[PDB]
Amino acid sequence: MYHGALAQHLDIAQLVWYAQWLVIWTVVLLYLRREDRREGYPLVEPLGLVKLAPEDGQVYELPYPKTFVLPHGGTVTVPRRRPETRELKLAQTDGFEGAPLQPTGNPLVDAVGPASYAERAEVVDATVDGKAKIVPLRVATDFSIAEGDVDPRGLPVVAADGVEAGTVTDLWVDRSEHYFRYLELSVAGSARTALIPLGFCDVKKDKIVVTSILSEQFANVPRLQSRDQITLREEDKVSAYYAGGLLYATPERAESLL
């Protein structure tokens, strides 16, 4: 006679096994996976045949909507229907479902592929007080660089060519993270400051090296609306431009190695 024996071959351990499984899958499927479809669903179709319903099992799929009450007023409902209405300057190679696309004009200005941004809300990012979160060091006068680092203010910005694009005007700080996000440089040749994300420049002792894009295309980095604060959308715009240059600066960046 044994502890935990339900028959001559059936024991409580064995049953628990399945039980365990059951739960795992249930959570995974009937929960986690639903939670995953809060963004970008339901699926869209630009070739296939009369479909208002993804992989099948799934048009329930989408969970019922949440309602994020936001810190500084307002509500967001998730999932949503946020429509893309920018008119993309992309021609298709083939009309085919999953055949890739060719940019028609300048991809960096027409904002497609790695140079595309998301249409974020056109508002300034804020602190817990209600100040602007991301500001330059002309504004956040209280903030400073840690003693022992290189102040990049004054240095030459060298682009992909090996050509000086201009000179560093300022740093921009995140006020709620104590972290530097942007270099504001003065694009030489024009009368303009352009903002580069700090993740696109290797800061040295003497120079700032910018591999991303060529010297000539610093002239076309998206213009800021205000002088001293940046909206959420403007951020995406600025970032996307340089990253797009990682595929579109020179013609050879397209191509495979052979």
Partner: protein
């Protein structure tokens, strides 16, 4: 077949090898040259397992095993059923892994994002290589590698570890284990913290980044900060294998005694002995 925002990103180029002929998506999957290659290994390698398992002595999924060749065969090929298929699969395996990793590189190129993901995926690949390839080279036989088999593989792990008398004491292991634990705990905290801020309960407003900080600086009195946790996660994760790899390679080629005996160095400093 597309996410509502997917189209603007689906552009040509940024393949590592052989340009436009393989540059397409099948459904949600991006293929590319390495896509094709991966598939080929996966298909062949799996089929090969099946055939091999068919001429085993069972079909219980736990109990099926494809073992490597005896030690007498050295670094050479073995008869197909006496360890050869093992060899076969192991190559399909490597094959698949690497094709997987490169595919990822192609993908990331196309998106203008960093290559961190592929590279991160490189770490486990290396450990696989360490266990199946290097360590057996250094001891000069394939028979030193581990067999493919759900329960079977553990038997290998088990005996291996008792070959040095108590693997727990092997210092490479210690480090790896520590990381494994820290990583798990840390994922929990990171998980929770985001979730708490997002879903604060009731009709409470979603909280800010400052609340994340406050929370930890209260409980344990330090906050690592938002970017860096991500950075740190990647680090912990990775040394699971990086440090372990040392302890693994050591055992056999560089140490042949029980692992506890090795701490003798400290235990036996003649000053306080």
């Amino acid at each position: 077949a597309l996410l509502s925002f997917e189209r603007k990103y689906r552009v040509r180029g940024g393949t590592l090898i052989g340009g436009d002929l393989f540059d397409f998506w099948v459904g949600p999957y991006f293929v590319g040259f390495f896509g094709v290659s991966a598939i080929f290994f996966i298909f062949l390698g799996v089929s090969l397992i099946g055939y091999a398992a068919s001429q085993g002595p069972t079909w219980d999924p736990f109990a099926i095993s494809i073992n490597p060749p005896d030690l007498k065969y050295g670094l050479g090929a073995a008869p197909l059923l006496e360890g050869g298929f093992w060899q076969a699969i192991t190559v399909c395996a490597l094959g698949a892994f690497i094709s997987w990793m490169l595919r990822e590189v192609e993908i990331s190129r196309k998106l203008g994002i960093g290559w961190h993901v592929p590279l991160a995926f490189c770490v486990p690949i290396f450990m696989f290589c360490v266990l199946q390839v290097f360590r057996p080279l250094l001891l000069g036989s394939w028979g030193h590698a581990f067999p493919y088999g759900i329960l079977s593989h553990l038997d290998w792990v088990n005996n291996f570890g008792y070959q040095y008398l108590n693997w727990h004491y092997n210092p490479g292991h210690m480090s790896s284990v520590s990381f494994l634990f820290v990583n798990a705990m840390a994922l929990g905290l990171h998980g929770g913290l985001i979730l708490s801020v997002a879903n604060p309960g009731d009709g409470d407003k979603v909280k800010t980044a400052e609340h994340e900080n406050q929370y930890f600086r209260d409980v344990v009195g330090y906050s690592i900060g938002a970017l860096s946790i991500h950075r740190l996660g990647l680090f912990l994760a990775s040394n699971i294998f990086l440090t372990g790899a040392f302890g693994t390679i050591a055992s056999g080629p560089f140490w042949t005694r029980g692992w506890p005996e090795w701490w003798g160095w400290w235990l036996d400093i003649p000053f306080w002995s």
